[model samples]
Target: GSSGSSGLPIIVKWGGQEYSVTTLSEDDTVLDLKQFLKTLTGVLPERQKLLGLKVKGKPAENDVKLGALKLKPNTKIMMMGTRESGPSSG
Candidate 1:
């Protein structure tokens, strides 16, 4: 989507960078935002882990809706890379 929305910048502080990202839709989900950021940051969805990305009252699930999260025009979301907790020996 084009950067045409006349709204507050989506403030995202990730990897020590504060970015004012453009939002595409209020109806988009956490996944959507992630994808959009991915396009800008060149980070793959799978590698987006550890970013501690969340929407609403909990960690962002794959199905959570962005609009339903009640995010404001300038909503800020924290992102961090997650180190996979490898399987433990039995």
Candidate 2:
């Protein structure tokens, strides 16, 4: 989708770097955001943890859609996460 037609561009901060992700619809979910980030940052969905996503400063659930949060265009979001290091010892 093109930012010119579908939706607005979003700024994401991850690992001290900022990336611009364009054309995200309101119906897009946190997971969708994660997938988008993956394209730009190479961080996989399962390893991405988004932060600073809040409603009135309170964190929102990951399953919620972006429009549900009423985010404005060019909204800034933060992300952090890491893949599993190794097999767990049970």
Candidate 3:
């Protein structure tokens, strides 16, 4: 078993990349998911836009558990956000 086996399940998709965040479980909340994707996707939580995890046509709050959003044993989600690098030298 891996040392950091706590993270598991889910395949998050981006523009040209998609991976199963081995650290993502339904027990974690939205923001929790972002934390992993934050590093995996290199996008901050503020700009981390997720799709297919909504309720009543709107995504649940970051504090909401992912399981509450109809997540199956094998969940597949999408994320959209860009890493930023500001202030370049002339």
lDDT score, residue 8, model 1? 39
Query: How well does each candidate superpose onto the true structure, as a TM-score?
Result: 0.60, 0.67, 0.74
Where does candidate 2 have its weakest 10-residue lDDT segment?
81-90
**Residue clash pairs of candidate 2:** none
lDDT of 1 by residue, 1-90 (tens): 867756436777677777667666666666877787676555665566423345454466647776665656666666655333444434
lDDT of 3 by residue, 1-90 (tens): 656434447888898798676565777787877887788878788787887677788777788877777576446778776787654434
Cα-based lDDT at residue 2, candidate 3: 55
- Predicted model with the maximum TM-score: 3
Candidate number that wins on TM-score, 1 or 2: 2
How many backbone overlaps does candidate 2 show? 0
- RMSD to the true structure for each prediction, in A, is 6.6, 5.1, 4.6
Model 1: CA > 4 A from native: 1-8, 49-58, 82-90
State in Å the error of residue 73, model 2: 2.2
lDDT accuracy of residue 69 in candidate 3: 70
Model 2 error, position 54 (Å): 3.2
